[PDB]
Design a protein around this ligand. Structure first.
Ligand SMILES: [Mg+2]
Ligand SMILES: [Mg+2]
Length: 740
């Protein structure tokens, strides 16, 4: 199994290194014979003898064109000739290319910014992560003493923990009694201990959380002074700290540094992500955080410390198992796309599509377009972008659309190379946007999308016919990845930095989308007696007013296999679900309840950061009276009861606690217990009645006596409780005033 590729240089020449892991042992294939190159379109062949003499310099030495050969290719569905120019070292390219294209006989130059090792993987047709191999993985984390007045680097490494299928321990230079900790002389001897560990297990994959921006940039700095050589690469080098966007990323030769942060900030959507945050949504339960306890352990020798140890092995374990959760999808994405997991786990879907197109382009001898320069990219930033029935309804079906966009792309053959072509004998016309797409031949993108979809279907048959749990799981992920990629083409067409950019294609796919949803919703109403209540870009909610639940489910099935044989191409409507009751507020706000009594809402619940218990309980009760019981007036009543108790200081002070000027206040009775507070802390308080603004006197929930402190009743009624139900009831005709 190919893990990755890079290159080094001897006496001015590149040498490719492919890191493999096959049948138990690590291997390194070297290749001294690959050559860098680019392309050029010349106004007349006679100019090459001029171009072969252009020159530049690097490291004080002269750089030239090695060889030049005339070649036949395809550019946007039009045959054409170009010259392939070779060189000696890949870095020669960045230093001589500009000159070559500012020559008069040059229309343009192509494929001059494809990194050498990826160029190699694509041209030699090698595909990383392809086998059936078992890779040893292992995570690790460090803990450093907070030195208030920072100077990033200053302050030893208190702890460092790792995690493997074989347990999970912690190593330290202090004394601590626990069946899983380790104590040694100094931090230096700690760091040497750490290195000796990895050297022993020799992991193929190292897992971390934000390891690209903290953990490696620390173990390093505080090692240049402890006088130790932080060696981890199977080649004996130190981790290579590179630069991606405006932040950084770290690489470890021979291995694979998997940083969860990027993936998670893309696979799971949350308001504020955090190791303990993201750990709960993945599979069940909590962990603990926000310490200033490091300060306590620093001042006392005894303990507090023995608790902080737990924190560590926990970061370490919570890390090893989340990584074990997102590795499969990222590995299949790598195999599907043709690039390493290091790069794939750190890129956007837009880039995944690009890397996929460049490979196919080479495969089919299609020359690639260039990325946008400052101005082109400047233009490409001018963006592109009915009402729901009102009231309470019942016996509702939701009809889903299967692959809407990629479906339209294939059916109408929408591609940059088929756009408004001259002399086209057969073509389709884009709805309101009159663009003509030629059908005299298959379009570049369309063909590839078509091949992808039927591929997914062959994997599904295989997944439904295999009986082994391990193969079934593998085929399942491979199957989902084709889906993620396929549903990314539409967005790609409108991606400013995209090589195969096409605004006429995007607007068109969007226009056809509305025509199809329009005609489908018209059929079901005029020929089957339904009434559409809400519509999305894809599916829609509908029902037959005053009919039995089974009468609606069955009538909807009759509709499906009546409209599909009538729909062109691969598009289909698919039964999705049934709901007993629901109401739709605006273009993206609604609430529904399934038969099992489960309630779902979109854009209605608390998006706050300062929510409280009593505010969350009341909104839930309002939604239950309406959806589970179909009683609007009962909801309205429930909201008055609550504001009444809360106005008569009767509400149990427990449900009033909140997490994260009022803050400036909490920082006082806290800075009293000698507890300092900076940006990453725990702020749990309760609002009280005070001599100033209605929401500025609060104190830690600790300091609370049912006879020394009362609670600011109006803060809860106005800032919190009402704005948690106002929008829902505003849809049934009520206002703020009918709630107090
Ligand atoms: Mg950490
Ligand atoms: Mg830790």
């Amino acid at each position: 199994m190919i893990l990755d590729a890079d290159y080094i240089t001897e006496d001015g020449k590149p040498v490719i290194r492919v890191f493999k892991k096959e049948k138990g042992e690590f291997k390194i294939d070297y290749d001294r014979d690959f050559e860098p190159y680019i392309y050029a379109l010349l106004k007349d062949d006679s100019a090459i003898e001029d171009i072969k003499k252009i020159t530049a310099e690097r490291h004080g030495t002269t750089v030239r064109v090695t060889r030049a050969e005339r070649v036949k290719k395809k550019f946007l569905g039009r045959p054409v000739e170009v010259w392939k120019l070779y060189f000696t070292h890949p870095q020669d390219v960045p230093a001589i290319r500009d000159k070559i294209r500012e020559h008069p006989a040059v229309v343009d130059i192509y494929e001059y910014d494809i990194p050498f090792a990826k160029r190699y993987l694509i041209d030699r047709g090698l595909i990383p992560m392809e086998g059936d191999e078992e890779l040893r993985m292992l995570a690790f984390d460090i803990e450093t003493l907070y030195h208030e007045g920072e100077e990033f680097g200053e302050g030893p490494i208190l702890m460092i923990s790792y995690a493997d299928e074989e347990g999970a321990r912690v190593i330290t230079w202090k004394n601590i009694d626990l069946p899983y900790v380790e104590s040694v002389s100094t931090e230096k001897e700690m760091i040497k201990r750490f290195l000796k560990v990895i050297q022993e297990k020799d992991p193929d994959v190292l897992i971390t959380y934000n390891g690209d921006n903290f953990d490696f940039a620390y173990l390093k700095k505080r090692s240049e002074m402890l006088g130790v050589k932080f060696i981890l690469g199977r080649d004996g080098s130190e981790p290579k700290i590179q630069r991606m966007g405006d932040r950084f990323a770290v690489e470890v030769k021979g291995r694979i540094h998997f940083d969860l942060y990027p993936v998670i900030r893309r696979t799971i959507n949350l308001p504020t992500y955090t190791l303990e945050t993201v750990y709960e949504p993945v599979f069940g339960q909590p962990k603990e955080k926000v310490y200033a306890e490091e300060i306590a352990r620093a001042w006392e020798s005894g303990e507090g410390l023995e608790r902080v140890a737990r924190y560590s092995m926990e970061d370490a374990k919570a890390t090893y198992e989340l990584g074990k959760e997102f590795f499969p999808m990222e590995a299949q994405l790598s195999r599907l796309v043709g690039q390493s997991l290091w790069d794939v786990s750190r890129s956007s879907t837009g880039n995944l599509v690009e890397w996929f197109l460049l490979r196919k382009a080479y495969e089919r001898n299609d020359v690639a377009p260039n990325k946008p320069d400052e101005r082109e990219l400047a233009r490409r930033t001018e963006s592109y972008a009915k009402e729901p029935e009102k009231g309470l309804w019942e016996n509702i079906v939701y009809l889903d659309y299967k692959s809407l966009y990629p479906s339209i792309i294939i059916t109408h053959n929408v591609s940059p190379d088929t756009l408004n072509r001259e002399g086209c004998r057969e073509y389709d016309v884009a709805p309101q946007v009159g663009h003509r797409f030629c059908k005299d031949f298959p379009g570049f993108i369309p063909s590839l999308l078509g091949d992808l979809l039927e591929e997914r279907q062959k994997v599904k048959k295989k997944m439904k016919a295999t009986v082994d749990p391990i193969e079934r799981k593998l085929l399942d992920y491979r199957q989902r990845a084709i889906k993620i990629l396929a549903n990314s083409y539409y967005g790609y067409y409108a991606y400013a930095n995209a090589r195969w950019y096409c605004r006429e294609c995007a607007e068109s796919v969007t226009a056809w989308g509305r025509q199809y949803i329009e005609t489908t919703m018209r059929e079901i109403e005029e020929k089957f007696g339904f009434k559409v209540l809400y519509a999305d870009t894809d599916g829609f909610f509908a029902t037959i007013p005053g009919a039995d639940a089974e009468t609606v489910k069955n009538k909807a099935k009759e509709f499906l296999n009546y409209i599909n044989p009538r729909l062109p191409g691969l598009l289909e409507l698919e039964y999705e679900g049934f709901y007993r009751r629901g109401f739709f507020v605006t273009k993206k706000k609604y609430a529904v309840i399934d038969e099992e009594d489960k309630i779902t809402t979109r854009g209605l619940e608390i998006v706050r950061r300062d929510w409280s218990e009593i505010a969350k309980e009341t909104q839930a009760r309002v939604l239950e009276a309406i959806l589970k019981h179909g009683d609007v007036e009962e909801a309205v009543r429930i909201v008055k009861e609550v504001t009444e108790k809360l106005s008569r200081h009767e509400v149990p002070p427990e449900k009033l606690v909140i997490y994260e000027g009022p803050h400036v206040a909490v920082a006082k009775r806290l800075a009293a217990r000698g507890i300092k507070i900076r940006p990453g802390t725990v702020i749990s308080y309760i609002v009280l009645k005070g001599p100033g603004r209605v929401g500025d006197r609060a104190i830690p929930f600790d300091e609370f006596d049912p006879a020394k402190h009362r609670y600011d009743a109006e803060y809860y009624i106005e800032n919190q409780v009402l704005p948690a139900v106002e929008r829902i009831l505003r849809a049934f005709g009520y206002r703020k005033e009918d709630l107090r």
